[PDB]
Amino acid sequence: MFNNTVRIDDLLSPLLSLVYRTYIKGDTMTMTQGSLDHLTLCAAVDSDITFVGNRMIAPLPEGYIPKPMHRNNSTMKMLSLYVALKKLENFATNSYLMAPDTSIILLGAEREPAVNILRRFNRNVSNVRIIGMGDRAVEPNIRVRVPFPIDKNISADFIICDINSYEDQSFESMFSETISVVTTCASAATRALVKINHPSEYMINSVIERLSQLGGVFYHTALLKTASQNPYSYETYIYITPIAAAVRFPFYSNSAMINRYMTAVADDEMPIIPSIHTVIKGHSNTYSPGLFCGCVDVQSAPLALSQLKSYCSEATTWRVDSDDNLVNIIARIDPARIALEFRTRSNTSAYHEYQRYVPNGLGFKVRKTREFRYMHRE
Amino acid sequence: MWHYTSINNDTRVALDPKPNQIRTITKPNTVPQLGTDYLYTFNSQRRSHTLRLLGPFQYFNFSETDRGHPLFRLPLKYPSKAIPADELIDNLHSWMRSVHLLHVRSEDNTLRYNWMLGVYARSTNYTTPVGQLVVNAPAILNYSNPQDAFNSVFVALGIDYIDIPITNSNIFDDSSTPYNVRIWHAPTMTEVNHILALMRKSTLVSTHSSWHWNVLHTFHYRSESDMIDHFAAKILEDWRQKEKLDKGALVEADRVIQRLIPLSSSTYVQRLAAIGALYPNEFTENVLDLSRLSTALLQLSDTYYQHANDQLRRLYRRMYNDSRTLYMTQRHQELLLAQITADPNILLYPYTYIFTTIPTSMNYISNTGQGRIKHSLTVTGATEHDTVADIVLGQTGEDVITISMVEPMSIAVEDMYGYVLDTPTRDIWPADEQIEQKGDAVALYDTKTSRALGMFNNTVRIDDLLSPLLSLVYRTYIKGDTMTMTQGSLDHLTLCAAVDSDITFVGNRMIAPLPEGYIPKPMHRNNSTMKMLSLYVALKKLENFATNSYLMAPDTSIILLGAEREPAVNILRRFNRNVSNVRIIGMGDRAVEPNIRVRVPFPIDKNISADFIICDINSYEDQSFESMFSETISVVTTCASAATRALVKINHPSEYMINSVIERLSQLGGVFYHTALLKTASQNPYSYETYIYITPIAAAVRFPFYSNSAMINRYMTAVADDEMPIIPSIHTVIKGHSNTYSPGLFCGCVDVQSAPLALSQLKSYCSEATTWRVDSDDNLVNIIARIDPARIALEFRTRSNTSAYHEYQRYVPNGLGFKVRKTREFRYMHREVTFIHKLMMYALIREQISLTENMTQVVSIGGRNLADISVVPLNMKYVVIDPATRIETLTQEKKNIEVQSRPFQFDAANMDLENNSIYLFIAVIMNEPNGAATPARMQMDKIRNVATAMLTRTNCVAYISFYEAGIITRLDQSTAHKTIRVEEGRLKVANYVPVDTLVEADVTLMLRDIGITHEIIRPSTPELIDACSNYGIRLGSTGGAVLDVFNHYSPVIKLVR
Amino acid sequence: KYPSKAIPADELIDNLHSWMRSVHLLHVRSEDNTLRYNWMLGVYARSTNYTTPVGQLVVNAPAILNYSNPQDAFNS
Amino acid sequence: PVEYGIFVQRGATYTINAAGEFEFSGRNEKWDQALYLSEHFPALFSDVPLAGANTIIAIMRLFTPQGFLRTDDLAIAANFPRASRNPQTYIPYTNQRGTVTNEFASRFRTIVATLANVVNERAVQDDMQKATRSCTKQWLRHLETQFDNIAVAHTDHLSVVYATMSNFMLNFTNNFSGNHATFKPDQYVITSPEGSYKPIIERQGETVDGLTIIDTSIVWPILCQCTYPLVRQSIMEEIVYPDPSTTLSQSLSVAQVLSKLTLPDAFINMILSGGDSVVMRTYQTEAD
Amino acid sequence: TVTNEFASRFRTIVATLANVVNERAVQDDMQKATRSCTKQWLRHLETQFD
């Protein structure tokens, strides 16, 4: 419920649309050729961008307002896995452009917008192949099943697998499929960045056992998770790379990325849907998680603040106009305030202070306000 | 994740304002703002304006007085362009001032404002009984309980219902509404049951599963089709919402079943309600096209009406037989129960069935929207084909697919001016070698060189090949978009060659902006223009290799001895305009002004000299070999005498011709001549014509004569062909497993049901196949698929005809391409040089292999993904010994291909060479299995081991490819190597790590020491023509420049027992 | 309208586009992949406003414009 | 001419599809009433926007009905005959009680504003004099005044006469839906399996003493040389509320007459209804 | 045909004629009335011709 309510695409949406909105007005100007801001710009707008010189993008041709670049939920994530690959080849880098005469593959593909944004990000670099290659792949991306056909020749300096069968399936098949996926991903590139939909300790360790089984090439490996992933996804990106030395301590056990998955299990109780309370009982302790929201006559306003104090830790309020007597009130329920206030049956409050507020002292705002059922936190 | 998690809520009620806000809901003081108060947009293609009011105003009936306002006159005022934002804001604002809803504001916090009735009463100008009730008792619009909002007006009017007109969402269209909503006086559930049951007695009505304000409301459509579009929009809504609930994400859904229930309707609506209830997998898969949504739903209901699945058919039929019942999944019903729990007296539709949804395992592929699908067909799959019928491809228009003869080359502008050198090897020229080489040269010249070579050399001209790049540079210069470039840069030269006008920089790295209204014509170039330019760049690169500027030094001169118009003389004169004192002149016998017209040899009287000379002489007249010889000799003689740096052409560069030229320079008194063969990237890709480069040097030149040189062999290996050149066919019939197709490509169209079949059949020949439907409404899929000989040599090894047809039928109908744009396939696609060299290798080794008798098998060690399969005959068993090779035991068993999947062991004790076997070592000897390059001594060592290991076997043949050392000497001096390099003296083909090269002499000496029979062969020109013909490939320019020196310096050792 | 200077590109595109909207060739679309459309006869019948016998034949039986074999396109 | 070309290329007619999408003819045929019963509708009244035929569609917006879709309440309660499964005459104009301004008349105002614009642009393309043009506008606004003046007595008096005649027993058919784009009368026939069907609605062309031809010209006297009992109010004529009994008895006489008009035919046919027959062979599958 | 092609050709002809006679009429500084009348006769000719 959380992983699907809080998708990353809608989560990052205002920022991307903001970058597109500034580029359209011509307000944007300076950025490095390899900078992440350059990538965000490539991901914000459908048009090719070209700098007129160092740190200076071309002004828009008159009357031309290119449409925002189309992004599915996995676009920003693929971008971040790309940035992660560039960061993994060497940590010192600030430029994220690929080296000339090198290539990358995005093995999971449909439209694969990231292949387009990447192709557009590296336009000034000579000789940079970039292709999606899914079984559902549309052009530019080649459409092909994994494992690769014995005839076809595929290789790259980078590979961003995102394979995930939509079909419900038996565990043996999901296992063998993921294993063959990581196998071809490792064989086809020096720097694979494979997805794992079900990163159980058994799955990841089996993958390491499989890389151990391949002849003559020891594989350094690491679990990984980008900021561009959906906040609640337990899906994890294993990172394969050959190293000349044998890898001491190669298997996982009680790893963080894995425990994010395995600790989750079928829940004994139904998920808690956030209620929007309108009745403020005095000292009830019967409120489900969510928030009080509504309106009251301004004479009653000091009273309600004296009563919602039992649950809500802080409460925004406002009259909407000087001539409108009601005060609107929003106040989310803090469990810590409940665990505090209900320790004993006394019901004291600073009501005498709150009655000092009426009528002009408790808010004014003509603008519509937009509270969220799920607020941001560090 | 089975249970639906959703917070149901009456959003329409939430939209109704508190009464106090009604005074200022227009926000009369401040202007409406885009995206908050309204959402204007202009579809320029449709030329249709669309204004959509936001907030409470989204639901707004308009009095005819409101329509008389100028704001509604605007779309008529601007037929063509978007209404200017100032006029839109001003007019919309004034009309916003014009509106004022009746209300009585009150202190109660529980109150709302019946906005629907308020705006409606306003729009009628209060003439309906509802309007009178409102105008006399405005306080009646206020309400605490949402339902009693209407019950008050019903009890007050004595009516059983009111019939509200619906809003059109865009406020600009004034078109008559499809239906109207009828609010009923039914406070209890029982009254609602009665109204529904009566509703089934009367035509064209339908209702929601649950109603807003908790008051029953029924849509009444003015026509059947209006009902159909309504139902379809609602089915889209409920399908999307159920798609979100199925993913389990929390949703703020207005009601659990968003789609409508017919109460009385035509057959077609009952069908819509049935498939709409079914929640068919086809929506989740995007199998339906939504452009004509209702039609898609009708066809879908058709497929369900006689579904292969008995469950789905009986379920659809049951849904059709009792359309008045609202079918819904159990997970919906639990949501409905939660809703009844939260609001015990809520009204919701009573007649409802809780069917169990039927799972379907078939995941159709789909992707609507532009983009052709670029299939990669598998050689084999789960499906077993048996005697498949021939699949005719339909004719396709040029409106959809054009077939250009050659692919224009995409390339960086600098790369055009690259060139390759080939220095002489032989220290001497014995007279017997002279008679032999002259015999080969006369015999070759007397019967003209290969007809297929000529077909290619003339089909793929360099001028049309480089055309898009040059015209692009001209097109950017014309728009003023071009700006910075160095004074001497190759980009400056390309610019001088793109436009007729003189260019002058205003300062360093900054060209002058075009004078206003001036658009100079593109510079005129014949086929030999770019080539002469590249020979000039080659001369500048040969005077010193360090240079980046290509301008001539002041007080120096050049001559272009071949001349007609000689555009290069003009582009050069224009390139060096800022340099003082730079004579540049053409001087042909056909020369036009500026170029002087004069015969070569020069007249005894005339004085000619220069620091550079670019001869391009080529008599058009057919002639005897003695005359061509003496003429070319006198041409090189005067070219050498007249300049310190001649760059003479040779039309027929036989070993005899070039060596005779060197003998002639040797004969001239007192001046030893360093010399080198040369070929630019700007030359025609297939021309064997070569530019010999003369220059005096103070030292006598060791090893001055040529023998078996690359540039020469590019010519002499070509000879009259035994067979007619292979013209690329365009096949339209896909026979099942035929092996009768000539090189070329399948192209055409098929009905989309037949599409998976055709892909299952063209897989036999084509390695990859692009496809696309042209439109959502057009059933045919266009298909282009060129024939790969490697795929033939693979698929026809055995008679089994398996394919992944079951996968391909997942594609239909939306899953295999969409593109409105015309596509332009080429009969001769571009390829990198290394790939073409590989195909020449395969042609050479295959022709070499067909000659051998009684060979049991071909063992290609390091065979990767079956890449050498084109060489091996369909009979003999194939064996791969590359660790990198993927294992496919089904494909292996079905196609007679054993695969070791282990590293080969080159140690002689571990060696296991079978008798009657052909061991391929094509470019595998130079690399370790992990890909790191092996040191050259280790390479010669493992070659020595494969040599000694074969010494015992009665019949065996190894083909050990390797790189000769001499190439590194040549690429140190050359420029045209975008792919090949020389990092720290080692070759660096493609993306492989640099690798040290063997010397041919030490290797042949070593093989003589082994005592094994051997032969160092390399692919010839006819093998190149064979590769390009059979594969449908054109060579390109840089590839044509570097192919000679590269392919000549990748010998294949041919060990034999 | 423009004896002296080139017709401005905006007017050319706009007018040519509106006339392009103005044209609509008679046809009966069909599933067969082997079919073509006798474009010559279609535009010709259109230009006569379907008054020639070819024009009547097309206006009454537009499907006759479709053809598999190119020659039978006219023989029909 | 240009928008006309763009419109007419789409076709002069269309048919609503079984999927409900419009399908325009693509041909410029002259309409005939024989088509009125055909699947086709005139294309002008499709109310479908076209990319460059906007002024046409706009002027066609002026023809939209200003009435409402009243249920035939009393005719239902009286249990009068009704072909429709829910009877519904479309009354041309709403009663306008209490309004300072008449909505019908204001609609006519916006219509004549758009008409003034069209006739104006034609007038300037025709380089015709300022005088004649201003005169055409003067007549347009004079029409608007006459229309306000008359409509005050149209919407508020005649409409209850439509609303009352909607309930008469013999008015069994539905007449309109208000949607010009899609309305077509339900076409019942008396099919006989052993005969050919007789359509009820047919272009039989018999004029019923001239009844089936329509002069649109009649609107001019209505707007101009005719008076209404409400319009006169400054004399106040009392409104007339006619005795129901006349049309009720006339309806009863018609009904009662045709009710027994068919009886002998109906009885005889009832008797012979099983009498139709088919020749049939009977092959014998077994001995004896 | 709904419309006669001969008559439509005469229509385009009289359109061009209206243009020529117009530009002569404006070069001759002649009154708006006489000019509009010439156009009225031109279109009347067009109707008679259809």
Ligand SMILES: Nc1nc2c(ncn2[C@@H]2O[C@H](COP(=O)(O)OP(=O)(O)OP(=O)(O)O)[C@@H](O)[C@H]2O)c(=O)[nH]1
């Ligand atoms: N005139 C008018 N119509 C309304 C108003 N509110 C809702 N409606 C109409 O009521 C019909 C059904 O009401 P809803 O259930 O709230 O709307 P819906 O069926 O979910 O579909 P949408 O209105 O498109 O969102 C819709 O077709 C609306 O056009 C209103 O305030 N005024």
Ligand SMILES: Nc1nc2c(ncn2[C@@H]2O[C@H](COP(=O)(O)OP(=O)(O)OP(=O)(O)O)[C@@H](O)[C@H]2O)c(=O)[nH]1
């Ligand atoms: N529920 C349902 N019944 C159908 C469907 N198609 C045909 N029928 C049944 O078939 C009867 C009439 O058959 P047809 O005349 O062939 O149907 P149609 O209108 O021509 O539609 P198509 O089958 O698409 O050609 C109807 O009374 C239905 O009961 C369908 O798609 N859904």
Ligand SMILES: Nc1nc2c(ncn2[C@@H]2O[C@H](COP(=O)(O)OP(=O)(O)OP(=O)(O)O)[C@@H](O)[C@H]2O)c(=O)[nH]1
């Ligand atoms: N009206 C009309 N004429 C056509 C059409 N197609 C071809 N023609 C005419 O047919 C004549 C001969 O046909 P083609 O052989 O295809 O044309 P061509 O002789 O090679 O010479 P070009 O038409 O100039 O390319 C030409 O003069 C064309 O004008 C058509 O679709 N409509």
Ligand SMILES: C[S@@+](CC[C@H](N)C(=O)[O-])C[C@H]1O[C@@H](n2cnc3c(N)ncnc32)[C@H](O)[C@@H]1O
């Ligand atoms: C989660 S989606 C994301 C794809 C891609 N990242 C994008 O831009 O949309 C992964 C896709 O991989 C495809 N796929 C599933 N199994 C595959 C396989 N075995 N080999 C290749 N692709 C596969 C599926 O069709 C699925 O749509």
Ligand SMILES: C[S@@+](CC[C@H](N)C(=O)[O-])C[C@H]1O[C@@H](n2cnc3c(N)ncnc32)[C@H](O)[C@@H]1O
């Ligand atoms: C292949 S053309 C190319 C000429 C020049 N590169 C250009 O820009 O067109 C070579 C020309 O040299 C001229 N030519 C032939 N024989 C010659 C000779 N003996 N001396 C001088 N010019 C000669 C021919 O007329 C021929 O047109």
Ligand SMILES: C[S@@+](CC[C@H](N)C(=O)[O-])C[C@H]1O[C@@H](n2cnc3c(N)ncnc32)[C@H](O)[C@@H]1O
């Ligand atoms: C040039 S590639 C393939 C050769 C040929 N061009 C082809 O495509 O079939 C050589 C491959 O052989 C493999 N290889 C390298 N050393 C090998 C060895 N000692 N034994 C078997 N295979 C080896 C490497 O993985 C490398 O990818």
Ligand SMILES: [Mg+2]
């Ligand atoms: Mg809605």
